[PDB]
């Protein structure tokens, strides 16, 4: 630029921290999605020997998505929510890099390890995971921050290191235009499928209910094969677990946009034998346990009758032996493998 000060431009150029100079991450790509690219990284100017995560954001410039992610992570600080450590802006290629502490594990990979093995574990690990998840979402909700995309894959867990066995919530769905769902269906609340125009705290809590069922059974509770928000098969699967909701169960269901569609497609008679009690009984979970009664409150059909994260944390489940621990693994050896390195091509 001619009308930008040359001395100001070269001084800032002399002083700028460039990501390629500071970290080693070549050939250490560990994630690739809509979000862009994620690399496991070590620091070159070696003050510490910690592993870090480097997110290069999809596209260029400052997207509204990128902007809200930066704006919010810049303020949010809590042990159960992933921390932004630094932000590198690369002017030449117009790419944005974010620095986080590295989490070796997550619930997708962890639960898939139990699925694999058991097909051929520490007490309070399920309880601890649930508590720390509820603590993390509570922090966000209290700051009027919704997640909007909560699933096992974005519930990370720290490997060996000083924060051993701590949950780190990540990939918060920052930027949905007009806070709208309409602009895997397994974790989505029945209101979303019936056409709800906006995301809510209650929608986040349903997803936690689904993750809790999944930690207990090693099975996605609303598993379902494979536009507008109405999805027939996903509703059928919910009704196979929960049963079909009565008027007394969900008074405002009439107010949903896809209620006429539901009535047209579904009959109460079909699901008369079904209930969460029987589903959990079939997956070897006791219905008179405090574990079950909390799950039942998280997976309530009517969103206004779903308990808050605050009250879930207050459940006497978390006062029953075994207690939650800060280290989910409770000092026991981590049997889960380290992450796998991906390619550029």
């Amino acid at each position: 630029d001619d009308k930008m000060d040359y001395d100001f431009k070269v001084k800032l150029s002399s002083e700028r921290e460039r990501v390629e100079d500071l970290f080693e991450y070549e050939g250490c790509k560990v994630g690739r999605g809509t979000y862009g690219h994620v690399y496991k990284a070590k620091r070159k100017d070696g003050k510490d020997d910690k592993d870090y995560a480097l997110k290069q954001i999809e596209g260029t410039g400052i997207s509204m998505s990128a902007c809200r992610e930066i704006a919010l992570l810049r303020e949010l600080k809590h042990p159960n929510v992933i921390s932004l450590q630094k932000v590198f802006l690369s002017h030449a290629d117009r790419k944005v890099w974010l620095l986080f502490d590295y989490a070796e594990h997550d619930l997708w990979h962890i639960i898939k390890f139990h699925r694999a093995s058991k097909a051929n574990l520490p007490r309070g690990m399920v309880k601890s995971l649930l508590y720390q998840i509820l603590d993390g979402i509570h922090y966000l909700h209290a700051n009027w921050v919704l997640h909007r995309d909560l699933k096992p894959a974005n519930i990370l867990v720290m490997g060996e290191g000083p924060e051993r066995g701590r949950v780190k919530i990540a990939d918060m769905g920052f930027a949905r235009l007009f806070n709208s769902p309409l602009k895997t269906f397994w974790y989505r609340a029945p209101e979303l499928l019936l056409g709800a125009r906006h995301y809510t705290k209650a929608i986040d809590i349903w997803a936690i209910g689904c993750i809790f069922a999944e930690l207990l059974t090693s099975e996605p509770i609303f598993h379902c094969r494979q536009s507008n928000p109405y999805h027939h098969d996903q509703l059928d699967r919910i009704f196979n677990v929960m049963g079909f909701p009565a008027d007394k169960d969900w008074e405002d269901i009439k107010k949903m946009p896809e209620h006429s569609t539901l009535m047209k497609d579904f009959r109460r008679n079909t699901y008369t034998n079904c209930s969460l009690i029987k589903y959990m009984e079939k997956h070897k979970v006791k219905p008179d346990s405090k574990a079950f009664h909390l799950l039942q409150k998280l997976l309530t059909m009517d969103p206004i009758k779903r308990i808050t994260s605050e009250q879930a944390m207050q459940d006497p489940y978390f006062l029953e032996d075994p207690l939650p621990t800060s280290d989910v693994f409770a000092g026991c050896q981590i049997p889960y493998p380290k992450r796998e390195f991906l390619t550029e091509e």
């Binding site: 040359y6 100001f8 902007c67 704006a71 303020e75 949010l76 209290a142 930027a175 235009l177």
Partner: protein, 266 residues
């Protein structure tokens, strides 16, 4: 609503409530070319530029305020020499808009708004048309974000003001005048020096004095450093004396020619 209750652990509070003497020391660079009166006249002018940009684009007041603060924070650190503030002003509106979630400003709409606003509402200060293309805004955006240390969530006095007037029960009587007085505080450094809620109490105090409402016991029922509130009241009252004695339209051509200018390369 995002981060509403977190001011006391926020990046605004911990990095962007500055010391007055520190602020005045970094300003002395630009006071080699401008007087203290002329520099303030500059600030008042560009606050009106950003308001005008916001109104054209149909942004709500809070988004405009955030863009206003982005501007102030930038020039609290760096010279007017650094980047042309004709370019910075729409860049701040543009970055601030992206912090919001309801609707997006496009590129051609921003450059259209910058062009049209300066030609129709500010041709007393600018003979030639807005010369910058979109990629200039985009280059400038990166510098803005970096040099604000990625601090994008700004707290403003409007939210506490709404809370206070409803506490009194004088929304019809006081709110429009007090909200207007809050708008005027952005013609000053107040947002760099005091938490938002203190600015709002001061603005509501002045609205009471102008409308002759007695809230001596309501204000007494608060727990707050009243010396600091009076400090802010004095700044508001001094601003209205400048306003009186400042003809923005007659003066800004001459002042904008005094502004130190970006050095180009060889």
């Amino acid at each position: 609503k995002a981060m509403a209750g977190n001011f006391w652990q926020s990046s605004h509070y911990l990095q962007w409530i500055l010391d007055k003497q520190d602020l005045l020391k970094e300003r002395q660079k630009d006071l080699k070319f401008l007087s203290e009166e002329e520099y303030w006249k500059l600030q008042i002018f560009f606050t009106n530029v950003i308001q005008a940009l916001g109104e054209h684009l149909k942004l709500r007041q809070q988004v405009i305020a955030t863009a206003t603060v982005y501007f102030k924070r930038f020039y609290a650190r760096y010279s007017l020499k650094s980047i042309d503030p004709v370019l910075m002003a729409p860049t701040c509106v543009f970055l601030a808009s992206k912090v919001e979630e309801f609707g997006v400003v496009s590129n051609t709409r921003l450059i259209a708004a910058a062009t049209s606003v300066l030609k129709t509402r500010f041709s007393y200060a600018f003979p030639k048309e807005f010369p910058y293309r979109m990629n200039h805004i985009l280059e400038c955006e990166f510098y803005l974000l970096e040099l604000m240390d990625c601090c994008l969530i700004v707290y403003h006095p409007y939210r506490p003001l709404l809370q206070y007037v409803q506490d009194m029960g004088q929304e019809d009587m006081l709110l429009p005048l007090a909200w207007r007085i809050v708008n005027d505080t952005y013609r000053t450094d107040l947002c760099l020096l005091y938490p938002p809620f203190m600015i709002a109490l001061a603005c509501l105090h002045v609205a009471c004095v102008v409308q002759q409402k007695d809230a001596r016991q309501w204000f007494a029922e608060l727990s707050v450093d009243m010396e600091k509130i009076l400090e802010i009241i004095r700044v508001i009252l001094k601003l209205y004396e400048q306003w009186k004695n400042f003809d923005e339209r007659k003066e800004m051509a001459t002042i904008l020619s005094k502004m130190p200018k970006p050095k180009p390369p060889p």
